[PDB]
Amino acid sequence: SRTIGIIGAPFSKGQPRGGVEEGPTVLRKAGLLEKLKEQECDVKDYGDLPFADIPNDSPFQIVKNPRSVGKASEQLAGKVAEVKKNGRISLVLGGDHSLAIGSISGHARVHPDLGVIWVDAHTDINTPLTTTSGNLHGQPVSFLLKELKGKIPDVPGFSWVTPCISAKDIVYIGLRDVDPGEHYILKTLGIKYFSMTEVDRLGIGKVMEETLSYLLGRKKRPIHLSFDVDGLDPSFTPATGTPVVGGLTYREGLYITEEIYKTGLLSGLDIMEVNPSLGKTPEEVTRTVNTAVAITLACFGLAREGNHKPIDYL
Amino acid sequence: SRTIGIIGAPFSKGQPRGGVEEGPTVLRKAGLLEKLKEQECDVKDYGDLPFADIPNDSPFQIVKNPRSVGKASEQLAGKVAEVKKNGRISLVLGGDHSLAIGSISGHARVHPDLGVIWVDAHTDINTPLTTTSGNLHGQPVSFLLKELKGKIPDVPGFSWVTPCISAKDIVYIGLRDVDPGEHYILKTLGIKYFSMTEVDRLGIGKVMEETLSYLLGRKKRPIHLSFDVDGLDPSFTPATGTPVVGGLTYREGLYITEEIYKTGLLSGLDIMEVNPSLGKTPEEVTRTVNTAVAITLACFGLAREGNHKPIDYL
Amino acid sequence: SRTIGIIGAPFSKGQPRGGVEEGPTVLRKAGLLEKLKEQECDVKDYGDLPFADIPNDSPFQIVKNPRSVGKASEQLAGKVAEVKKNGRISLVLGGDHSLAIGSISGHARVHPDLGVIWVDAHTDINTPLTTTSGNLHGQPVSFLLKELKGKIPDVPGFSWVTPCISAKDIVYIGLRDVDPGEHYILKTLGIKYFSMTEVDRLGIGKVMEETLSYLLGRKKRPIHLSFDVDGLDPSFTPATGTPVVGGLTYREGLYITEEIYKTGLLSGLDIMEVNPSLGKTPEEVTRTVNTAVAITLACFGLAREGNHKPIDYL
Ligand SMILES: CN[C@](CCCC[B-](O)(O)O)(CCN1CCCCC1)C(=O)O
Ligand SMILES: CN[C@](CCCC[B-](O)(O)O)(CCN1CCCCC1)C(=O)O
Ligand SMILES: CN[C@](CCCC[B-](O)(O)O)(CCN1CCCCC1)C(=O)O
Ligand SMILES: [Mn+2]
Ligand SMILES: [Mn+2]
Ligand SMILES: [Mn+2]
Ligand SMILES: [Mn+2]
Ligand SMILES: [Mn+2]
Ligand SMILES: [Mn+2]
């Protein structure tokens, strides 16, 4: 049976807009922990991480808040590894997506053979040198990939990072805002991806079959799902910092996560980039958090066809 | 050519919210009868059923308004059988979904070999003993299924019911809010279903091919379509009592019904759960009724590709 | 590499509502020309066409403004042929869809072997004799088809027209409001079409594979894409004169145009029926123009998966 470890990561300095720090808080007050208990799940809350303010953190070239982002990920890596050693599925509530550096790193210390599914409008694979914004939430994958070592500069705050995943061990789903440098890396490294074009072409059904066969065909291994809520269309998740139109539907998001749950191999989960302060109305915040909660519950067994306990209901 | 018998069923006591009684009225004032005449159809209106008030109707255990629901279905069964004996396709305008007990029962008196297609967010297959709400609109299928006799208590108002359909003769499309007891019955009885997960997986195209091959592969027979407007997403049909997000699209609803029309075997139709009083705005009511009318017109021949009379237009 | 010739066609008299004349203006102020330059494209603006007022233009039978529509198309045909002789892809910004008579005609003077893809809720294939509205924007295809000569009356303003395309050389995508006369022509002439029913059945992926194999299977040839913004659902393009619900999605629109771009054979493009004055709000106008611009950029190489220059980004 599923056992879960919840880690709050109230961190925003991987991007400019502040309110993503309240992500863990609004997801908890939506009753995420209770709803997980309502279904099959043994839940332990490891709390919100205390991220010290590092007030002296000047840009490294164009890269903003590098020491703050680096330490937050260092701390998160430690907590995630701690939850994995305890035999639980780590559930990280973000927080901006730079935290994936820490989440995937901590996870990989215990399960070096993990495969990553990255649901997002973005590849987040800019390097400190290709980025034009300097926002580190658009860079976490570059820090993680083995093939890109020697292309990543010695950024203050990140000396602890050892890139733990090969380009062959990640699949993107939902891409529709990919920078030129990122596209170059994507094609050069031969990374498997299903942009919105592929989802339109094949249907989400075939996308998931291909995703899972690619990642699990040779050998069964732990899955890490890094879910950026901007992966889904802004009609479902508007309260987020970098919304892009033409996204995955609510249905597609639940299909992705239902299929991931059914593998029995989900080992780590990130629910990222919920920013309640960017909702144009109270309903837009509710709609975003509701969807993120629904996505999460699907990851842990809630099926649209229904669920039942192993007894005779009649 | 198609010949139709319209029966209004202004009934609400299968659920708590009152305004579903006005379903027949708003569908008629939308010009449903006229629009049916505009296309190929010979239409006879059998009127709105007069449902006597039964003021003495205390719950049977948890089950609410059982005598009221039972008599309404008894009356509707009689009217439907009357319209079928006259060689017409029965079109029942609801009204809450408990009325399906009467619609399917009346239909089956004349065509015992009918197969049912049930488009809905819900299976409506709770028994009087598995229900946690007591609302009979969530129970009609349990009263209809032969396999479940002996599991249905002697509910006041329902002594006239003889379950007329086998578990093998129904297909669900659109499921996304299925209670644990219902899921148990679903799996135990081996009922064919396409929840939203299956629609996402396969596409509505394959769903309809499988639905129709399953029901009509061995032997051609009459089709009964029980269409709950909550089958479609609340962005298309918001004015309904139990809306669930992540539903079938407008397009999917028209595809289902276009394909059903093309079989030449539609024999009975229910258009259920339109509640104009639950529209948050006047436009939400219009949008809901418009969609329900569009769905109905598709059932009777209106095709998106166009239609033409058997003459030379040039 | 792609080279483009922009032609503004501020013309409205193919239909009753006036504001479609401002189509070229709002598309330009959206920064269409600049955004085309931002990506691979060499852009030359051939200006907005000066359409003389023809104040004496009484209906021909039921057909409205025939001399105005005819001359506007005659003028546009000349300009388009001029841009094609200069080796550029013609990009016509409309303007109502009657202008397609001129766009396709001018294009075909230089490339007689063109195949047409027509993305629209409508077939626009009524003749002056089958039309019930008299609005010429619902008639341009009938003037273009060789198979229909002798069925088109001598309409004032159109003596210059020579029908340049066979019924075999056009594919419709997006149909859901087809008049009886149009359906008759569709079936009689054996025109290839994918109404919304077919898109639902097969998926846009298979639709494009079939569309392109049909048009380009025997012999590679120039493609003319006539894109009516009402092809997409009114939730994406509301500011248009004849919106029909149940349309192609934003994603489907970009998929169509991405796949068309990838053939390397796009030769002519029409972006038609944007009417900013019919937006119920300022956001509805912005949403419509934004989408039309996005559609256009996709036609000229912008891919959702990303794009990059032929250099080493690392
Ligand atoms: C696509 N790259 C962006 C967005 C990063 C989003 C990170 B996420 O976690 O939400 O996915 C934007 C770069 N563009 C900004 C607009 C102009 C072109 C560059 C970046 O800052 O790197
Ligand atoms: C899913 N079952 C419900 C809804 C019935 C809808 C009937 B219809 O005709 O619209 O399809 C709801 C039961 N749940 C209520 C919420 C808490 C869990 C139980 C019930 O009352 O049985
Ligand atoms: C479908 N035909 C219409 C619409 C033409 C739209 C042209 B376009 O460029 O936007 O595609 C409408 C005819 N109907 C009007 C409503 C009643 C039935 C006839 C016509 O006027 O011919
Ligand atoms: Mn993102
Ligand atoms: Mn991201
Ligand atoms: Mn229902
Ligand atoms: Mn129902
Ligand atoms: Mn049109
Ligand atoms: Mn058109």
The DSSP-derived string for A13-73 is TTSS-GGGGGHHHHHHHTTHHHHHHHTT-EEEEEEE-----------BTTB-SHHHHHHHH
- CB-ligand 2 contact for B137 (6 Å cutoff): yes
Locus of tokens 């295809």: C141
Q: Is C47 left (phi over 0), alpha (psi -120 to 50) or beta?
A: left
DSSP state of C169: G
Which range marks the domain in which residue C77 is found?
1-314
For tokens 């255990």, the residue is B61
Method used to determine the 3D structure:
X-ray
Cis previous bond, C203, omega within 30: no
- Cβ C76 vs Cβ C99: under 8 Å: yes
Phi, psi angle pair for A9, to nearest 5°:
-130, 75
Could you tell me which of C299, C311, C313 has the C-alpha nearest to residue C36? C299
User: Is B120 a catalytic site residue?
Assistant: yes
Burial class (CB in 10 A: 0-12, 13-18, 19+), B208: buried
* Cα–Cα distance measured from residue B56 to residue B16, given in angstroms and rounded to the nearest whole number: 17
The answer to whether the CB of B80 falls within 8 A of the CB of B136 is: no
Query: Listing from the earlier edge strand, what are the strands of the sheet with B223-228?
Result: B42-48, B3-9, B89-94, B266-272, B223-228, B115-119, B170-175, B192-195
CA distance A200 to chain C (A): 6
Tell me the CA end-to-end span of chain B in Å, nearest whole number: 25
Ligand 2 in reach of B22 Cβ (< 6 A):
no
Task: Tell me the residue length of chain C.
Answer: 314
Residue type, A78: G
Q: Nearest residue of A to residue B173 by CA position?
A: A305
**How many alpha carbons lie under 13 Å from residue A149 in its C-beta half-sphere?**
11
Short-list B242, B246, B243, B250, CA closest to B290: B250
Query: Are A305 and B193 an interchain contact pair (Cβ–Cβ within 8 Å)?
Result: yes
Please spell the DSSP secondary structure of C269-298, one letter per residue. Answer: EEEE---GGG-SSHHHHHHHHHHHHHHHHH
CA–CA distance, B165 with B226 (Å, rounded to integer): 14
Task: Give the span between the Cα atoms of B234 and B246, in whole angstroms.
Answer: 8
The amino acid at B62: I
* CB-CB contact of C279 with C235 (8 Å): no
| CA-to-CA dists, residue C181 to A26, B39, B166, C125, C185, angstroms | 57, 14, 45, 9, 6
Work out how many domains chain B is built from and give that number: 1
Give ∠ CA B58-B64-B65 in degrees, rounded to 5.
65
DSSP B15: S
Instruction: Give me the helices (H) in C167-241, please.
Output: 180-189, 196-202, 204-216
**Backbone torsion region of residue B39, taken as left when φ is above 0, otherwise alpha when ψ lies between -120 and 50, otherwise beta:** beta
CB count within 10 Å of CB C237 equals: 28
Active site includes B97? yes
Length of chain B: 314
Asked if the Cβ–Cβ distance from C181 to B308 is below 8 Å, we say yes
Q: Which 8-state DSSP code applies to residue B305?
A: T
Calpha distance C90→C80 (Å, rounded):
6
Question: In terms of DSSP bridges, do strands B192-195 and A192-195 run parallel, antiparallel, or are they unpaired?
Answer: unpaired
CATH number, position C62: 3.40.800.10
Question: What subunits make at least 3 CB pairs under 8 angstroms with B?
Answer: A, C
Return d(Cα A238, Cα B156) in angstroms, integer.
50
Q: For residue A92, give the H/E element and its range.
A: strand A89-94
At C135 the three-state DSSP class reads: coil
Q: Are A272 and A96 in contact (CB under 8 A)?
A: yes
Say if residue C268 is preceded by a cis peptide, omega within 30 of 0: no
Report residue C297 CA to chain centroid gap.
15
Asked whether the beta carbons of C198 and B258 are under 8 A apart, the reply is no
* Residues in chain A within 8 Å Cβ distance of C205: 200-203
Cα–Cα distance measured from residue A244 to residue A235, given in angstroms and rounded to the nearest whole number: 10
Spatial contact of A166 and A141, defined as CB atoms under 8 Å apart: no
C177 is catalytic: no
Say if ligand 2 is within 6 A of residue B120 CB: yes
Peptide bond into B95 cis (omega under 30): yes
DSSP letter, residue A146: G
DSSP string of C35-73, one letter each residue = HHHHTT-EEEEEEE-----------BTTB-SHHHHHHHH
Find how far residue A276's CA is from the centre of its chain.
Answer: 17
The answer to whether B127 and B151 have CB atoms below 8 angstroms apart is yes
Contact between B174 and B195 (Cβ < 8 Å) = yes
Mapped onto helix, strand or coil, the DSSP state of residue C7 is strand
Closest to A87 measured CA to CA, from A270, A221, A297, A267? A267
Query: Mind telling me how many Å the CA of A312 is from chain B's nearest CA?
Result: 8
Rg, chain C, Cα only: 18
Number of H helices, E strands in chain C: 10, 8
A45: its two tokens: 């809350």
Q: Which residues pair with B174 in a beta bridge?
A: none
Encode B85-110: b = buried (16+ Cβ within 10 Å), e = exposed: eeebbbbbbbbbbbbbbbbbbbbbbb
The helix/strand/coil state of C221 is: coil
DSSP single-letter state for residue A125: -
| Residue carrying the six token digits 């020309």 | C33
Q: What is the dihedral of CA C173, C177, C178, C180, to 10 degrees?
A: 160
Pick the catalytic residue from B57, B96, B120, B252. B120
What number of other Cβ atoms are within 10 A of residue A192's Cβ? 16
Does the CB of B189 have a partner CB in chain A at under 8 Å? Answer: no
The pair of structure tokens assigned to C116 is 């047409």
CB atoms within 10 A of CB A178: 26
- Please report which residue ranges of chain A form alpha helices under DSSP H: 23-29, 32-38, 66-85, 100-110, 140-144, 180-189, 196-202, 204-216, 250-262, 282-299
Name which of B203, B254, B305 is nearest C183 (Cβ-Cβ): B305
* Entry resolution (Å): 1.5
Q: Which helix (H) or strand (E) holds C195?
A: strand C192-195
- What's CA C236's distance to the chain center, in Å? 17
Helix C66-85 / helix C100-110 crossing angle, nearest 10 deg? 30
Catalytic residue set of A? 97, 120, 122, 124, 137, 228, 230, 273
Q: For residue C272, which atom of ligand 3 is closest to its CA? A: 9
Q: How far apart are the C-alpha atoms of C142 and B313, rounded to whole Å?
A: 13
B217-241 burial, b for 16+ CB within 10 Å, e for fewer?
eeeebbbbbbbbbbbbbbebbbbbb
Query: Which run of H or E residues covers position A89?
Result: strand A89-94
Asked if A15 and A96 touch (Cβ cutoff 8 Å), the reply is yes
CB B271, CB B295: distance < 8 Å? yes
Cα-based distances in Å from C21 to A294, C13, C64, C273, C276: 46, 9, 17, 9, 9
**C-alpha B88: how far from its chain's center?**
17
Residues 6+ apart with CB under 8 A from A90: A4, A5, A7, A80, A83, A84, A103, A106, A107, A267, A268, A269
Q: Which ligand is closest to the CA of C135, given by its number?
A: 3
For A206, residues 6+ apart whose C-beta sits below 8 A from its C-beta are none
Question: Cα dihedral sign for C145, C149, C153, C158?
Answer: positive
Within 8 A by CB and 6+ apart from B35, the residues are B293, B297
Alpha-carbon A267 to chain mean position: 13
Say which of C203, C204, C313 has its CB closest to residue A180.
C313
Please enumerate in sequence order all residues whose Cβ is within 8 A of that of C53, keeping only pairs 6 or more positions apart, or say none.
none
Residues in C closer than 8 angstroms to B308, CB to CB, are 180-181, 183-184, 187
Any idea which ligand is nearest the CA of A182? 1
- Round to whole Å and give the CA distance between A289 and A301: 19
User: Is the minimum distance from the CB of B74 to ligand 2 under 6 angstroms?
Assistant: no
In angstroms, the CA C136 to CA B126 distance is 57
- A247 burial class (0-12, 13-18, 19+ CB within 10 angstroms)? buried
Do C293 and C27 touch, CB atoms closer than 8 A?
yes
Radius of gyration of chain B (CA): 18
How many CA atoms within 13 Å lie on the side-chain side of A18?
A: 0
**Which residue bears the tokens 């418009």?**
B290
**Tally of CA atoms within 13 A in the half-sphere of B168 that contains its CB:** 6
